[PDB]
Structures are given as structure tokens and as C-alpha cells.
Ligand binder design. Structure first.
Ligand SMILES: *[C@H]1O[C@H](CO[C@@H]2O[C@@H](C)[C@@H](O)[C@@H](O)[C@@H]2O)[C@@H](O)[C@H](O)[C@H]1NC(C)=O
Ligand SMILES: C/C(=C/C=C/[C@@H](C)C(=O)O)[C@H]1CN[C@H](C(=O)O)[C@H]1CC(=O)O
Length: 261
């Protein structure tokens, strides 16, 4: 068969990540806190877990440039965590980094540790097309993110209809981060095209916000890895193993469940 316990026991790895609730946070505390110890969140538990199985040591580092990884339109150069990996500056990228076609062409991904899809976040119409087929209520996504790239690329009529809308209204309707989008829903009359996984989080934390419709597509977040990295195939197996016993479900339950609505 294929055995993995301690399979990369000798290695010490550099993990790049980005701050995003509730995947990666700085711990709230009162003594000065140091190293890996600074951080917490779903991705942080996932790391601990993957490290226990695969037996490596690791250092967490926030992406220096502070972006996920888009390709520059003008000169076709990669930027965020995606960049960090190519220049081999990091071994692993553990974050809500969507496994994208474009991204997969320059980097290797593990199999998903979470599956999701694009959805609508509105103030408490119920279709992606209920939206595209109209003009009253404005809608948008995070600029140059996986969500946007979906519509930009889509040959399905509905989503290419919607992409035309947002493209024409680029600077008024595309936001620069999740929080900006959330706030823009609460403040204006705006439907935010957001990843279901993150909607589900804010939904049970703010009682005025709801999800409209189901999943427009389906993504996964994968552990990121330089092109052809040896470690990858192992990380995939180590993932499914956690998924198997239902640790992932429990980690999910831990950070997401809470207050209510
Ligand atoms: C495989 O995993 C375990 C391996 O433990 C030790 O460390 C690894 C890196 C190898 O070098 C190996 O020689 C050592 O024994 C085993 O303890 C375990 O029985 C194996 N699991 C299965 C079910 O195949
Ligand atoms: C929260 C988020 C922000 C992305 C911001 C872009 C502008 C970037 O900094 O590269 C990511 C996380 N998952 C999606 C992705 O992998 O691209 C994206 C969220 C989204 O597009 O809805």
C-alpha cells in the first residue's frame, strides 16, 4: 500500500498564510506571544493536525505582500502566496486559497480540505439569475479573486451576463476584501458575491445578513505547494485521513458554530 506516518519527519517547513477570519487569526492575549504560538484558527489547527500525522516542523509566516495570488494583467506575473511558492520562498500555503485552473497552471495544490462555492450575501429575489436579470439592486465581488475570475471566465450565459454588468461598473461595484463587501451590504443596497464557506460564518454572527440561493459553482480550498513539490501527495492523504475520522468536520464545527439566528 502506502504509509505516511512520520514520512517527512526530517523536514522543517516554512508555511506562508494570510490573515482571514476564521481561518487564521492572531491570538488575543496579554503576555507577549511568539512564533507559531501567535496564531490560531481553522487553518492553524489543520496545520497542527497535518504536522502530527506527517511529523514535520513548521514556521508560519504571513504573506509578505499580503495577497492571495493573482496574475498581473499587464506583465503576467504572479503576486501573493502563489508567488511566494514559485520563488520557493515557502513550502506550503495554508489559507482559504481557492484551487483555480489559472492557479493550478503555475502551482501544485493538494486535494481540498474544504469544499465550497460562490453564493449571495444580502441583507435579511433568490437566484443568481434573479439578480442578473435585473438592474435595481447592485451586486459585485472581490476584485481579481476566485469569485470574480469565475464570471470573467464563464461561458455560461447567466454568469457572463453578470460579468458584463460588473465589468462595466468595475470601480463602483467590485470591492477589495470580504469585510469591505460585508459592510457594503449592510450600508447600501447590494448583493455580495461571496464564498459560501465565509457566508456561513458571518451569517451566524450577524443576524441581519442572509444567504440567497444555493451554490453558483463548486470550489475547494487546497493546501498550496510549489510546482511538483514532493510533499503534496502526502498532504492529500493526510487530509483525507482527518476527513475520514471526522476531525475536519469538528474543526469546522469549532470555529463556525456559535451565537446563532
Ligand atoms: C507505517 O508508519 C509507522 C512508521 O514508523 C516509523 O517511521 C517511519 C518514517 C518509517 O521510517 C518506519 O520505518 C518507522 O517504523 C509504523 O509504525 C506503522 O506500523 C506503519 N503503518 C502502517 C499501517 O502501514
Ligand atoms: C478572501 C479572498 C480575498 C482575495 C483577495 C484578492 C484581491 C487578493 O488579495 O489576491 C480570497 C479567499 N478565497 C478566494 C480566492 O482564493 O481567490 C478569495 C475570495 C473571493 O474571491 O470571494
Amino acid at each position: 500500500p502506502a504509509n505516511i506516518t512520520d514520512s517527512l519527519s526530517n523536514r522543517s517547513l516554512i508555511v506562508t498564510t494570510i490573515l482571514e477570519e476564521p481561518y487564521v487569526l492572531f491570538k488575543k492575549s496579554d503576555k507577549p506571544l511568539y512564533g507559531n504560538d501567535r496564531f490560531e484558527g481553522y487553518c492553524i489547527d489543520l496545520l497542527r493536525e497535518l504536522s502530527t500525522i506527517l511529523g514535520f516542523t513548521y514556521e508560519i509566516r504571513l504573506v509578505e505582500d499580503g495577497k492571495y495570488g493573482a496574475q498581473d494583467d499587464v506583465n503576467g506575473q504572479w503576486n501573493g502566496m502563489v508567488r511566494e511558492l514559485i520563488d520557493h520562498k515557502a513550502d506550503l500555503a495554508v489559507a482559504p486559497l481557492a484551487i483555480t485552473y489559472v492557479r493550478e497552471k503555475v502551482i501544485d495544490f493538494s486535494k481540498p480540505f474544504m469544499t465550497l462555492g460562490i453564493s449571495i450575501l444580502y441583507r435579511k429575489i433568490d437566484s443568481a439569475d434573479d439578480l442578473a436579470k435585473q438592474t435595481k439592486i447592485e451586486y459585485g465581488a472581490v476584485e481579481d479573486g476566485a469569485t470574480m475570475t469565475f464570471f470573467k471566465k464563464s461561458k455560461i450565459s447567466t454568469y457572463d451576463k453578470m460579468w458584463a454588468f460588473m465589468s462595466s461598473r468595475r470601480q463602483s461595484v467590485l470591492v477589495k476584501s470580504n469585510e469591505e463587501g460585508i459592510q457594503r451590504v449592510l450600508t447600501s443596497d447590494y448583493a455580495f458575491l461571496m464564498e459560501s464557506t465565509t457566508i456561513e460564518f458571518v451569517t451566524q454572527r450577524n443576524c441581519n445578513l442572509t444567504q440567497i440561493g444555493g451554490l453558483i459553482d463548486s470550489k475547494g480550498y487546497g493546501v498550496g505547494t510549489p510546482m511538483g513539490s514532493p510533499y503534496r501527495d502526502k498532504i492529500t492523504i493526510a487530509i483525507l485521513q482527518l476527513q475520514e475520522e471526522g476531525k475536519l468536520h469538528m474543526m469546522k464545527e469549532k470555529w463556525w458554530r456559535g451565537n446563532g439566528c
